[PDB]
Structures are given as structure tokens and as C-alpha cells.
Design a protein around this ligand. Structure first.
Ligand SMILES: COc1cc2c3c(c4ccc(O)cc4c2cc1OC)C[C@@H]1CCCN1C3
Ligand SMILES: COc1cc2c3c(c4ccc(O)cc4c2cc1OC)C[C@@H]1CCCN1C3
Lengths: 468, 467
């Protein structure tokens, strides 16, 4: 049912009429333009797009007719290029005559570098390069989710290492709760998969299926969850029976970790009186492999975390780890899953450290902040034409708006290189062909309807690892 | 290839073990909780979800086995409720034993009112009400896009009325440019469909297909566009040939409206020297039905709009309308489609009014600001359990967190009524059954796998009209 002829910005339908006459090549590129800092970006998600939308026979006689009929009404005019699309159907069996070169998935690249390039492989299809901009520029989302997720991992690693002396359990310190808070089922899958580049905990089941279909893992699944209560399973017992709900849930899940939302009526009373006194005998009996994870879900996230830890530290036996930081017993942990984004995550771990609480005690859950409150503007994700051939001559093209030099685009044929210090540089104006900086790091990943280079999710996770 | 058994928050897989024993009924509701204020919301998008995801045979033996295999690995344990899902397959031929009642689509409802309710119709399926919360709560996105778009329409209507004395072309004053700035193809269609509740201009073609399939219009399409240049079609001509690019494009599109991005190198030079002198002869000759629409795309959105209008006003014949506001000639208009969201739109029309420019002169295009930069928290969209039947006894259920009184949920069986002054009131604790108000405004839209009541896009548009 997907029709690539109907998967572009409307105005692109009219572009074949606007290019200079005798244009044989249009060459475009994607970058996260330069200027939390977000100095480096995780390149993730293009392989999903190539496989789901671009590869194989994407043009049929029925798809051309459907698009002709929609655009006739949408524009109230006959501007649709049926001839160009028929050419692709008849000459290439509806395979796109396009070459895409990209940096490997999971690579961590500084801002302002070429990440992928797109060009037509047939001169008659000069107009196709920018037709597919809309579908390829959506790459911004998994790039931005993967990047923002990795930036939160860097904060958790710094504070976990300072307060505990190791990074054990780091991949489980940020759990994806974003399924309800995203705009669609398709978005849930894409965003959850991008989070699983960096972490292993997710409630967003749609992410597992996407990874298995488009990337692959050695392991049966790329992420995991544990049993957890919500407000409906506590509040269903009645206002006077919160203790009965808690006793039932921890007894049902006595041998596995279990998360219990504790703020239905009064989080402080739940921690001090219900967990800390009435049900304490059911908690101190649990295995190290099956902790109670208390989940506050309302109020000021920092103030609530600090008060919950002070409460639990007075009702349960607290130890002092080798770094001097307080540690709850191994059958008891906290997860803060409300109001968490990269800024509040920083504030909580810093406030915990100042009160001498180990980051071993806490994990975070993020919903909207992890998968929804991100824009194409956060990393200045941009797709621009840099090179055309018109009357057999290559010309270097760019924009350079007077009022915003940050929107200046790169000129000519691009390539990505290692510098002598081992950093990245993007060469412009075809200067990569001089091989003063060695070989281009971009690889052909799509050519003429075929995916030509692919990466497993395992390779992507290894590429995206923290420097440590 | 969608499997409703795999379309929930993972933890919901475990909830059938957490509810009180002898629970026969779980009843839950959606609202935009009370605290631009966004005092009223456009209810839009549930019918999409009911038809795409919830209706008909959604359970098969193969879907149950697939779910069982995934959950075994995801939890490293066998917690999946295979028996519950098998019961629905055998007893209802895989149709969901759920009743959903909703306010009519397009209705504009004040914050803090019930918009829809969900309950199981079979006692064995008490667990199913909140299993489908994840899919249903995503209704927040079309509600929020439709609501934010209508709030922008209110600002434009106010300023167009004060500066021009009428609302002609209001439905073409905010164009959807959001396709590349959203997170997915599916989000693009949903968001574009929500904008078309209020406006007619879109570049997001995916919205048209969604409206045709799930809602329907008397007109062949719900939304329109005009030819437009992008930086690629101007810059491809070369840095020294911007004039040649502009001339080619307006000549190819001489008899239709055409938008031309004019900031590739220098927006001010383009307006004053290229449009205003070198190509002025190809502009002043155009039909009122085929204006040149100049599109700045960089800089401070307010400062750039006001400077562009000042430039054009010195190069082209400006009139003064009956309200005393300046009006460009009919063959010349402007569209600002960079940095536009609800706050900047207000800043620009207010700044224009202060410089005595009519809002007739300007349209807005919005991308990320219109379809992407919105969260479930903006309208406090929430799905909560309000009523359960345990041991044959009905109990009013709710949350009331000590630290956030704004997160208090409603109690018991709910109903939506007209007040004697013609406002809306949500009645709690089954008090709607006393019939002290008129009829419940919630109608059954889904029952036992069937969509029971459908709205056309034309009725939705009429419900969402401005006062
Ligand atoms: C021993 O303490 C813990 C164990 C887990 C386990 C998982 C887990 C998944 C997501 C998440 O957000 C947290 C956790 C977790 C948290 C714990 O303590 C805070 C999944 C794995 C699959 C088999 C064994 N499971 C253990
Ligand atoms: C006469 O001036 C204008 C006309 C239009 C027309 C459309 C239009 C669509 C989207 C949009 O954002 C703007 C416009 C527009 C803007 C104009 O002036 C600024 C679509 C319709 C389909 C047949 C006739 N078209 C006219």
C-alpha cells in the first residue's frame, strides 16, 4: 500500500520543471550542521528506510495512475511527471536509479560532517535525487533519538563510575517508557530501536520486531523488561487497600524483579509505612536477583527521589560502598520514570551525589523526553544539493543566506576522511579525489534498487559504545 | 503484519496477575486534564485507530504463538496470558469484547472532561481494557495537532478581521510543511490529517490518503498546494544565476500561484533588486489568481517579514484598505515558513499590525512547530481506570498523588452533558443515570469488534469551526 510517488512534499512534484535545462546529475547530502552541546551524532536508521521504502520494484503502472489522479485534484492541474516515472518502470523494472553512500551505522561523528550522499545513476532521472529527500531526511529522528540516548548514557556512566567505581548495569539505567507518549505505532518502533543502540531496557515492544526484521541480533531479542504495576492495578483495589495491592503484586512476582508505582495516594507514606513497616517482611526476604523497585511518579523529580531515598535509608539497612556512597540493600531499588529528560537526569544524579547516595540505587525511565520531545532542529539535520552537471559541466552549488551563516551548505562532491590525528574531516569540491587524506570513509549502501552494504544491530552497538 | 498482542507497553503483559481477584469489569477513560492556555481541545483521530488497529478479527492462533515466543525472550519468563487471548479467539472469533463510547469527532470540549470511555463486555476480559490503553492513548497526537492548529486559526482570524474586515482565505493562511520534520511516514499522515480539520493547504500528501480511507470527503481531496521552488531548484543554476532561476520558474508557472524561496544568498537584494527591478516586469503582469508568493526562510522571522514588506512596499504599488492597513498589489504575496509555531505566529501578526500591514499580505508555513514539537503533556492527555466491579460490587477508583493535585483522576462511571448555560459538564459516580441533565453526549463508537458509529471529515470540519 506504500506508494513512493505519494511519499514526497507536494511541491517536489513540480521540481522537474524548475532545474536548469540539460541537467544530467543532481547530487545531494545530509549533515547535522554545526551550531547540552551535542557535539557528536550517532548515525543510525538509514538501513530501515532503504529496506522498507526504497529497495526493489517501488514503481508500478497502478502506483503511477494512483499518483496521477491524486495530484490532478491536489493541484487542480496536470503537473505530475508521468513520463519520468514510466521511464523508470520500463527501463529499470521500477527500481530507483539512485546511488547512496553513507558512513557506517552506529558511527559517532562530530557535527558538520557529511553522513550520506544521494545522486541519480541515469541522466533522465536528475529529478529523482530530491524527490526522495522527504523519505531520507526522516533519518533525523533515529539519529536524534540514538544521539540524545547516548548523551544520557555518558552522564549515567560519569556518575555511576564516581559513586560506585564501575559501570556494572549501565545498559539497564535508562528504560524506554515512550510507547504511549509518541505520535504513532511506526514512530514507537523507530524510536525504541534507536534507544536500544545504547541501552537494553524497553517497554516499547515495537522496537524488538523492527531490529529483528531490518538489522538482526545474535541474541533472540535486543531488549528486556520486568513485571511492573501501573496506577490501574494499584487503584483497582480501592483507596483503603493500597497495602493489599502491594502485598498481592510482590507475592505474585516474588522470584523476579518487580517495579511498583508507589505514589497513587501518598508516596512518602507508601515508602515509610507500607513498604518500610507493614510489608517490610516481604521485602527483606527477596533475592538479589529479584529486587523490589519502588517507582515514584509525581512531584518535583529531584526532591521526590532524595526524600524517598532518605525514607528507605531509615527503614532498611544501608551500607557504605568502597567510594563512601550509601547503598540500599540489594533487594531494594528505585526507578524515577516521571519528568525525565537529559536535563532533569543530570540534576538528579548530581543531587544524589551531593547527598552521598550511590547511582547504583537508581534507574531512570523516560517517555516523551526520550522519543517525542526532539526536533530536526536539535542537531540541525539538513539535506541540500551540493553538485549538479548541466550541459556536461559539473558545478558546485550551495546556499549561503546573509542573515544566517550557520545555514551555509557544503560545495561540490563530498567525501569523509580520517585526519592525521584520527579525527574526521569532510572534503568539498571533489578534493577527496587527490587522496591527500586517504580513502573515503563513506560506503555505497544503495545502488539501482539494491541494498549493497548492511550492518547487524550488534555491529551498530559496538560502533556506538562510549569512549571508556 | 500488525499484531495487537505486541502493541502494548511490555509491563501490561503482567497486569492480569495484579488486578484484585474476582474482578469482572475494568472501566477507564481519557481526558485532557485541567491545570496559550489551550482551554478547549478538538476531539479528533479515534476513528483512525479503531479502524486501523482494533476492529474485526485481530487475534489468530499464529499471533498468539508469535506473542508467546517474543515475551518468553523479552521477560526471560513465561508470564504471557495465553489463556485469556485464546478465550477471545474461541468465543468471539478473535474480535475484542470492548465497548468504547466517545464524544463526536470534531467536537471542541473544555479541558477536564471525559472524551472517551473503555470497558470490557465479557467478565473474563477484565484485563483487556488497559491492554489497549497504549494504542488508544496515542489519540493524544491528532487531538493535540488539531487543537494547536485551531488555536493558530483563532489568532489569524482575529488579526485578519481587525486588519481587513473579513476572514476571506483564512483556511489558506497556515500551510503544512511538516512532512520532513516529523518522526515517521505514519506520523506524517496522522498529523497532516489533523491540520486539515482547520485548514486546506498542505504539502504532506500522506494526510489526503488517510482522510479518504478512514473518514471521507464529498470533494475529491481535503487539501491543496501550489507549485513552489526549494533551495535545490534555485541554487542548481549557480551562485551568479539566481535571477535566471527566478525568471525560468515564474515563466514556467505564469498562470498559477507560485512560491519562490528568495533567501538562497541575500533575501533583501532578491526582493529589492531581482523581484523589485530586474524581473518586476514579469510580476506586475501576473493575474490576481496567480500571485508570486515570496518565501523568506532564514533570520529572525519577525524582523525578516517586516523588512521584506518594507522593501516590497517601496518597489510595488501599495494600497490602503478600508481599515487603514497597507495592502500589496494582488499579484504579490509573502509566506513565512521558517521558525513558525504558535508563539512566533502571534509575534509576527502583532508586529505587522503595529507597522500598519494587513494580514491579507502574509501566509504562514509550519513544519516541526505544527506536527512534531508537541507532547502528551501539552494538554495533559491521560487514560485512567475510574470504575471496577470486584465480587459483583462496583467500586469508584482513582489516583490522587499527595505532591500533584492536578494528577487527581475522576471517580466511577462517567457521562458528558450540556449544562443549562450550554457548556459541558462531566458527571462522576454514575450520577448521569439520574437524568438531571439531558442525554449523555458520549456515543458507542466500538462494540465487540465492530465500529458502530462513523463521522465524515466534512462533519468533523463543521464541529471544529471557530465560534
Ligand atoms: C537484579 O536486579 C535487576 C534485574 C533486572 C533484569 C532485567 C531488567 C530489564 C529492564 C530494566 O529496566 C531493569 C531490569 C532489571 C533491574 C534490576 O534491578 C534494578 C531483565 C533481565 C532479563 C532476565 C533477568 N532480568 C533481570
Ligand atoms: C490566488 O492566490 C492564491 C491562490 C492559492 C490557491 C491554492 C493554495 C493552496 C495552498 C496554499 O498554501 C495557498 C494557495 C493559494 C494562495 C494564493 O495566494 C497567496 C490552491 C487552489 C487550488 C486551485 C486554485 N488554487 C489557488
Amino acid at each position: 500500500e506504500f506508494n513512493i510517488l505519494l511519499a514526497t512534499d507536494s511541491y517536489k512534484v513540480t521540481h522537474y520543471k524548475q532545474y536548469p535545462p540539460n541537467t544530467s546529475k543532481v547530487y545531494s547530502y545530509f549533515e547535522c550542521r554545526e551550531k547540552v552541546k551535542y557535539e557528536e551524532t550517532v548515525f543510525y536508521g538509514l538501513q530501515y528506510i532503504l529496506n522498507k521504502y526504497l529497495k526493489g520494484k517501488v514503481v508500478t503502472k497502478e502506483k503511477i495512475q494512483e499518483a496521477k489522479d491524486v495530484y490532478k485534484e491536489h493541484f487542480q492541474d496536470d503537473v505530475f511527471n508521468e513520463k519520468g516515472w514510466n521511464y523508470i518502470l520500463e527501463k529499470y523494472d521500477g527500481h530507483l536509479p539512485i546511488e547512496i553512500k553513507a558512513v557506517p551505522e552506529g558511527f559517532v561523528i562530530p557535527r558538520g560532517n557529511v553522513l550520506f550522499t544521494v545522486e541519480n545513476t541515469d541522466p533522465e532521472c536528475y529529478w529523482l535525487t530530491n524527490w526522495i529527500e522527504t523519505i531520507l531526511v526522516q533519518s533525523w529522528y533515529p539519529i536524534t533519538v540514538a544521539t540524545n540516548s547516548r548523551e544520557q548514557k555518558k552522564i549515567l556512566a560519569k556518575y555511576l563510575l564516581e559513586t560506585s567505581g564501575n559501570l556494572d548495569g549501565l545498559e539497564y539505567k535508562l528504560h524506554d517508557f515512550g510507547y504511549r507518549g509518541v505520535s504513532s505505532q511506526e514512530t514507537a518502533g523507530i524510536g525504541a530501536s534507536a534507544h536500544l543502540v545504547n541501552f537494553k531496557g524497553t517497554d516499547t515492544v515495537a522496537g524488538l520486531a523492527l531490529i529483528k526484521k531490518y538489522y538482526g541480533t545474535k541474541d533472540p531479542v535486543p531488549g528486556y523488561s520486568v513485571p511492573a504495576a501501573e496506577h490501574s492495578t494499584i487503584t483497582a483495589w480501592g483507596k483503603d487497600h493500597e497495602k493489599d495491592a502491594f502485598e498481592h503484586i510482590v507475592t505474585q512476582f516474588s522470584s523476579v524483579p518487580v517495579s511498583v508505582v508507589s505514589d497513587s495516594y501518598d508516596i512518602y507514606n507508601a515508602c515509610e509505612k507500607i513498604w518500610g513497616e507493614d510489608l517490610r517482611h516481604l521485602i527483606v526476604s527477596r533475592s538479589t536477583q529479584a529486587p523490589l523497585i519502588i517507582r515514584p511518579d509525581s512531584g518535583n523529580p529531584l526532591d521526590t527521589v532524595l526524600k524517598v531515598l532518605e525514607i528507605l535509608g531509615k527503614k532498611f539497612p544501608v551500607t557504605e560502598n568502597s567510594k563512601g556512597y550509601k547503598l540500599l540493600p540489594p533487594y531494594l531499588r528505585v526507578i524515577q520514570g516521571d519528568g525525565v529528560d537529559i536535563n532533569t537526569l543530570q540534576e538528579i544524579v548530581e543531587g544524589m551525589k551531593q547527598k552521598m547516595w550511590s547511582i547504583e540505587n537508581i534507574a531512570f525511565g523516560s517517555g516523551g523526553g526520550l522519543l517525542q520531545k526532539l526536533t530536526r532542529d536539535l542537531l540541525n539535520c539538513s539535506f541540500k544539493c551540493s553538485y549538479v552537471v548541466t550541459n556536461g559541466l559539473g558545478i558546485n552549488v550551495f546556499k549561503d543566506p546573509v542573515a544566517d551563516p550557520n545555514k551555509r551548505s557544503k560545495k561540490g562532491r563530498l567525501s569523509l576522511h580520517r585526519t592525521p590525528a584520527g579525527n574526521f574531516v569532510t572534503l568539498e569540491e571533489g578534493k577527496g579525489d587527490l587522496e591527500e587524506y586517504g580513502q573515503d570513509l563513506l560506503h555505497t549502501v544503495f545502488k539501482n534498487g539494491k541494498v549493497t552494504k548492511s550492518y547487524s544491530f550488534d555491529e551498530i552497538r559496538k560502533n556506538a559504545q562510549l569512549n571508556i
